[PDB]
Design a protein around this ligand. Sequence first.
Ligand SMILES: *[C@@H]1O[C@H](CO)[C@@H](O)[C@H](O)[C@H]1NC(C)=O
Ligand SMILES: *[C@@H]1O[C@H](CO)[C@@H](O)[C@H](O)[C@H]1NC(C)=O
Lengths: 49, 49
Amino acid sequence: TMSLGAENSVAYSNNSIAIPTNFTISVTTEILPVSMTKTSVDCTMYICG
Amino acid sequence: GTGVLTESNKKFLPFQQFGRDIADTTDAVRDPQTLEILDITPCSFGGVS
Ligand SMILES: *[C@@H]1O[C@H](CO)[C@@H](O)[C@H](O)[C@H]1NC(C)=O
Ligand SMILES: *[C@@H]1O[C@H](CO)[C@@H](O)[C@H](O)[C@H]1NC(C)=O
């Protein structure tokens, strides 16, 4: 049976805050399709040769 | 068939008479009189715009 992730009890209380003291610059790659190959068929020549 | 016949660098085994492409199309032949291997190419075609 697959695991959905590690469980994490967030340290919540009505007067506690967490604030980051540092950062990282992250560079992430996103790849997107933009075109197909352009095609045409002479279908007298496909059907009848 | 119909096409343009040309001298080729294909290496047929002695019993083989025809050559085929990935999608079953005949793309070479052996001349049955003088046993050269001929590349077959389609006669030129295209749309007119
Ligand atoms: C912040 O992170 C860098 C490495 O990314 C480290 O060199 C630096 O000491 C860190 N600064 C603090 C305040 O922790
Ligand atoms: C067919 O006859 C020609 C006559 O020039 C000869 O050169 C050739 O070797 C012959 N081929 C076969 C397969 O008998």
